[PDB]
């Protein structure tokens, strides 16, 4: 599955930082 | 900000990483 656009709002942004920015 | 680019508009993982 291609890395397609997703809405990331509120605390999902935190989750995304944790999954995508942090080791 | 990330909310305008990824919550008001959706964003890919690769776009989100721009904000790390």
The C-alpha atoms of residue A10 and residue A2 are separated, in whole angstroms, by: 24
Phi-psi sector, A10: left (phi>0), alpha (psi -120 to 50), beta: left
Judge: B12–A6 Cβ closer than 8 Å, yes or no: yes
Elucidation technique: X-ray
Backbone angles phi, psi at A14, to 5 degrees: -55, -50
Interface of A with B in 1-23 (CB under 8 A): 3-10, 13, 16-17, 20-21
Q: Inform me whether the C-beta atom of residue B18 falls under 8 Å from chain A C-beta atoms.
A: no
The C-alpha atoms of residue A8 and residue B15 are separated, in whole angstroms, by: 12
């Amino acid at each position: 599955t291609f890395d397609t656009p997703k809405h990331r709002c509120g605390s999902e942004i935190t989750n995304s930082y944790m999954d995508l920015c942090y080791r | 900000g990330v909310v305008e680019h990824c919550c008001h508009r959706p964003c890919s993982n690769a776009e989100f990483k721009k904000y790390c």
